[PDB]
C-alpha cells in the first residue's frame, strides 16, 4: 500500500562543486640552461672538455 506520510525522504547533497580533470594543465615548468645541469651528485653532466 502507498502511504504518503511514510514514504517521503529528505535527500541531502552539496550545493556547488567545480570538477577538474587535467591537473597538470595548471603548472608551467621550465628547464635551466642545459650547460649547467647537475647529475645525482653535485657535479654537472658533460663537464669534461
Amino acid at each position: 500500500q502507498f502511504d504518503f506520510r511514510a514514504s517521503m525522504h529528505m535527500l541531502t547533497s552539496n550545493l556547488t562543486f567545480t570538477v577538474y580533470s587535467d591537473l597538470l594543465a595548471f603548472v608551467s615548468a621550465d628547464t635551466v640552461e642545459p650547460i649547467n645541469a647537475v647529475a645525482f651528485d653535485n657535479m654537472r653532466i658533460m663537464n669534461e672538455l
Binding site: 594543465a25 608551467s28 615548468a29 621550465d30
Partner: protein, 72 residues
C-alpha cells in the same frame, strides 16, 4: 612615363644578400615587441629573400588561445 621609385627591386647585384639583412633586422624588431605579452625563447630564425620562419619555444604548453593571440 617616369615614375618616382625609391624602393628596392630585383635585378641588382646586392639584392640576394642585402634583402636577407633587411629581414633579419625586421623580424628581430617584431619579436621584441611581441615579448611584452608573452615569454618565450627564439630557437631559430631563417631568412631566404622575403620568405622566412621563426620557431618560438614557450614555457607552458601551447593552447588554442596562444595561437590566435600571437597571430593578432
Amino acid at each position: 612615363k617616369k615614375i618616382q621609385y625609391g624602393a628596392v627591386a630585383s635585378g641588382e647585384k646586392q639584392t640576394k644578400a642585402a634583402n636577407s639583412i633587411a629581414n633579419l633586422a625586421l623580424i628581430k624588431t617584431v619579436l621584441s615587441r611581441i615579448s611584452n605579452k608573452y615569454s618565450f625563447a627564439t630557437k631559430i630564425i631563417r631568412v631566404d629573400g622575403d620568405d622566412n620562419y621563426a620557431v618560438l619555444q614557450f614555457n607552458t604548453e601551447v593552447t588554442k588561445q596562444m595561437v590566435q593571440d600571437v597571430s593578432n
